[PDB]
Design a protein around this ligand. Structure first.
Ligand SMILES: Cc1cn(C[C@H](N)C(=O)O)c(=O)n(Cc2ccsc2C(=O)O)c1=O
Ligand SMILES: Cc1cn(C[C@H](N)C(=O)O)c(=O)n(Cc2ccsc2C(=O)O)c1=O
Ligand SMILES: [Br-]
Lengths: 251, 251
């Protein structure tokens, strides 16, 4: 069985290689997730074929309980594995299985260096410095659903200054940080990626929530536990660390 | 079925309550893991009986491939679950199953506030400041097995200054930090716990490795996936955050 692997274009996890060389199949891609998949394929001994998810989505549910994205590919048995920056969540675990996480992360703060600011509590109580998140993204939703008083304050501040504090995407938010007095709340993984490439920018404080990216499989898949095993081996042998450094390290 | 839960005395996860009131069974204990277990017991609907592991050990293997600690309790079917600060590792996954992690952590640096020191790379290249770990503990072993050049340098420095840099236990190491020019490499969870209670001490840099604590079960247990589900619900609903703050927050 050649395993069909669903994934999604997302830098630096999955990208088309910058080459016009005759590269076919899996060879057309590169990135953290491609390196992970090679390691998994060597530990477990499976052949695989990478297929980008046709609708370009991660996976969310509608009211009929209909799914889309990589999640739907697994539900329909069109893919055997999903290897992507795909968050392990309660709702998704209802319909697919996940390996244990190959990467842990959480919401954090992107801001300029040299400022007395040290946490979200420092941002919350003031207003001279604007702070927000990408509109309708995982980070905005966390704040909106939060019942922790300090994040409740941060939300009301975002949603009131709605038109200005909530950016359209990460690019815009990053632009806003460099060009004005603004702090972007985003996934720690993304922040590390930007800070490595922008010496004017830095991460503020620690992690605001916690979640992991895991390899998705259909419910009952005999590969899920094997992939957890392989992930633990890679972590313990320092290979996940080097794979992250390979793709994250900047100039 | 009343589930038998193995666990281990370890502050602030599991402690005897400071009371001479007539408390029996599970009521004799308190701590993060007791609160987690109550939440799990309410989400899943199970009765349980907490039993401290008789040999007081987490779980390690000997040459005959014989295990001890909470791991051995699960292997022998004397316990249905292990709920403790028990790290999910490749070797243990060979003999027991684990839920996904309820807490993520990694090795980090405990040091005084106000010093220009910002990471392990800052410690590695110098020698005016001693730095080490608890002798024969998980953190020492990581450095000893490491193939990352910068941690290879940190190890040779520890193992040469062996008699002085490698402390006997966390208490001693913490004492060494407060009373001399020394930095202790220890689990981030433990560091946060100390820093909350010692305003003279602080965490340096980020996480050096990554691992999680999970609930252990025998291989094949029908409770493992249910516990992962409950854990994700608790995380997403901010309950793991509040349980951690309850036990970690200092004066
Ligand atoms: C790499 C990556 C994947 N994903 C998809 C997400 N992990 C998922 O599984 O649906 C994501 O939401 N963000 C964060 C994000 C993207 C647009 S807004 C936003 C946020 O953090 O709010 C990412 O950075
Ligand atoms: C709470 C806790 C559990 N454990 C046990 C460990 N999680 C295990 O699963 O065996 C541990 O090794 N440390 C760290 C530790 C203890 C003595 S030395 C040391 C270290 O970090 O080297 C802890 O702080
Ligand atoms: Br799992």
């Amino acid at each position: 069985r050649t395993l069909i692997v669903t994934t999604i274009l997302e830098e630096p996890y999955v990208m088309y290689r910058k080459s016009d060389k005759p590269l076919y199949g899996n060879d057309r891609f590169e990135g953290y997730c491609l390196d992970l998949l090679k390691e998994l394929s060597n530990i477990l001994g499976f052949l695989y074929d990478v297929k980008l998810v046709p609708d370009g989505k991660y996976g969310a549910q509608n009211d009929k309980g209909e799914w889309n994205g990589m999640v739907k590919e697994l539900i329909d048995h069109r893919a055997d594995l999903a290897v992507a920056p795909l968050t392990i969540t309660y709702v998704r675990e209802k319909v697919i299985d996940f390996s244990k996480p190959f990467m842990t992360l959480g919401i954090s703060i992107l801001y300029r260096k040299g400022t007395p600011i040290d946490s979200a509590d420092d941002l919350a109580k003031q207003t001279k410095i604007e702070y927000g998140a990408v509109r309708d993204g995982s980070t905005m939703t966390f704040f909106k659903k939060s019942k922790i008083s300090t994040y409740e304050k941060m939300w009301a501040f975002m949603s009131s200054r709605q038109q200005s504090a909530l950016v359209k995407n990460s690019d815009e938010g990053i632009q806003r940080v460099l060009t004005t007095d603004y702090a972007l709340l985003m996934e720690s993984t993304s922040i590390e990626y930007v800070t490595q490439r922008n010496c004017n920018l830095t991460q503020i404080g620690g992690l605001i929530d916690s979640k992991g990216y895991g390899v998705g499989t259909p419910i009952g898949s005999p590969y899920r536990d094997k992939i957890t095993i392989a992930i633990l081996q890679l972590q313990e042998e320092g290979k996940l660390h080097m794979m992250k450094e390979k793709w994250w390290r900047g100039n």
